[PDB]
Amino acid sequence: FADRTPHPALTEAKHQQQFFQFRLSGQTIEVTSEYLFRHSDNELLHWMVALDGKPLASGEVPLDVAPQGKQLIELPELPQPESAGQLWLTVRVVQPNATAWSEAGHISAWQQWRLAENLSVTLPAASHAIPHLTTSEMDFCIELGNKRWQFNRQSGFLSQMWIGDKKQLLTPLRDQFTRAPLDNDIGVSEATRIDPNAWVERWKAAGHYQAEAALLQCTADTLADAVLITTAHAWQHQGKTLFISRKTYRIDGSGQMAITVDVEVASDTPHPARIGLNCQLAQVAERVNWLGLGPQENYPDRLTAACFDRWDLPLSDMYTPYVFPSENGLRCGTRELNYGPHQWRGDFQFNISRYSQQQLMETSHRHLLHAEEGTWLNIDGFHMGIGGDDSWSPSVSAEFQLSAGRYHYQLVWCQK
Amino acid sequence: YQAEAALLQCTADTLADAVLITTAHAWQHQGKTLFISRKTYRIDGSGQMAITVDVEVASDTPHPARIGLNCQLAQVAERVNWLGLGPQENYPDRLTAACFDRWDLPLSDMYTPYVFPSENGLRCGTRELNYGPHQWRGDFQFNISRYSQQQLMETSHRHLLHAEEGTWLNIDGFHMGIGGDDSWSPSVSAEFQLSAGRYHYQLVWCQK
């Protein structure tokens, strides 16, 4: 920024430009120096092995590598844990002494790998409570203890949740296929010249910002130990169907709501910017805690600098204050998200903030944004890349476009 | 090749207009779990059986060659009719020559008689498959023949293969590439390996 505060992209540059490259083969790390003239005389390697966030083993090794040379670091016998989960190894190069240009402790290079995974073969514990279904003309209502869910039979969405007598939502949980466009999406270098190939022009022309959801199906069924809700919606713009979404909600005796989503996208509509859900939660909390890539904003085509771990930040750090407001603050590769009493589990990307996508799209300057009531949550199964080979022509590469035609993802929503 | 399926869950439920069966299995080899598979079968009043499959693959097992279903059908028919890429054998990294259309061939043309027997006769990008009274719909790759995968793996020469009773059907949601930059070192490119960790696909099985 003009005051010399970093954008999140600066960390991506730092990581790709590092002077140490790493390879893993079994228990061995090979370190390669990309210095041309200096010996690595102010460098030590810290390694850590963690199991879904929890530390297991750790260590340090001095680096003694000639310019353009290699060093092989053998790791100790790593622990075999009992429990399920993925093991992660992280190495970081630390400069122990100050230089003319850096403090003591400066981190100059890092890298992360997956080690052994143990898949979870334990079935969930059978609860004695059965959720109860009530049918009115307008609603399906499910009760279990103090918890209550309500589904609107006309719109076909989850419209409210109660813990005790405290409402949890200000806006229903609905599909989202759009983002507040980024500068790379807008694709303009001269204010007088509009490119009809820019992503934002293609999305407005196809009617992605105006598309209306029509209900096809909304049904409720009692199983032995669960209530199952089934919905289907079609998004249409002037006759043409753009997207179809089929959903199941399974509410069991443990309180957990499992959401399964299947989406179809018309092959001749421009590929969508995302496939996910959004809602406005009623409560504002101070912290956000997640298990996934972080701690800074990261996107499918800008996530090599980010590391899998357990991260915990104040809500204000989950918003990037770009001077021209846009979609911002995404975290990819996430397995668990905790915010107030809610927990979401799955394999998803999310962003969380006090500004809606509609507000970020309508506002030309960051100082004109005002915090809305509650918190906006966007949870995505899939998200398009951001591009940036240039900013005045489409720059997202074909492997980061959502072009598959059919998409599946699942979430669990529970109260921790 | 030796992995054994252990049952985790098998449950049945009546809905308003359907029966729903739920199963889960784990494939294990000497303590280690390689794959988990969760399935639902929904049989409705129209006769159609909808199958939904979700698979998890351990990140440190070598990526699998395919993720699908197989069975041996009791009947032998003369023709195979499908809507999808064809008419010749095609694989995810060799399908640019094939064209989407409605194809109809005798069963014997769905087998490629390579002199050294192997996996053969796959058709990708398929939306509908008809064989005798059965119809399968979805988005899948399939192969159909009188030889099992076990027979093709054990037999060194094509003249020593014998037709089994009935027809073997393999229906895949996902299939690895075949490679061939060379044949004496791993040659499948990373975009054709099944490395995603989690996989979903669905089929409808009905009687036309």
UniProtKB/Swiss-Prot annotation, chain A:
Name the positions where substrate binds: 392
Q: Which proteins does it associate with, and in what oligomeric form?
A: Homotetramer.
Q: Into which family does the record put it?
A: Belongs to the glycosyl hydrolase 2 family.
Name the UniProt record assigns to this protein: Beta-galactosidase
Species of provenance: Escherichia coli
Gene (UniProt)? lacZ
Swiss-Prot record, chain B:
Q: Which UniProt keywords apply?
A: Glycosidase, Hydrolase, Magnesium, Metal-binding, Plasmid, Sodium
UniProt keyword annotation of Metal-binding present: yes
Question: Which GO biological process categories is it annotated with?
Answer: lactose catabolic process
Q: What start and end residues bound the annotated signal peptide? A: none
Where on the tree of life does the source sit, at the highest rank?
Answer: Bacteria
Does the UniProt entry include the keyword Transcription regulation? no
Q: Name one GO molecular function term.
A: carbohydrate binding
Instruction: Cite the binding residues for substrate.
Output: 184
Which Gene Ontology cellular component terms are annotated? beta-galactosidase complex
**The family this protein is said to belong to:** Belongs to the glycosyl hydrolase 2 family.
How does the annotation summarize its subunit structure?
Homotetramer.
Identification of the protein by name: Beta-galactosidase
Covered residues, full protein: 822 to 1029 of 1029
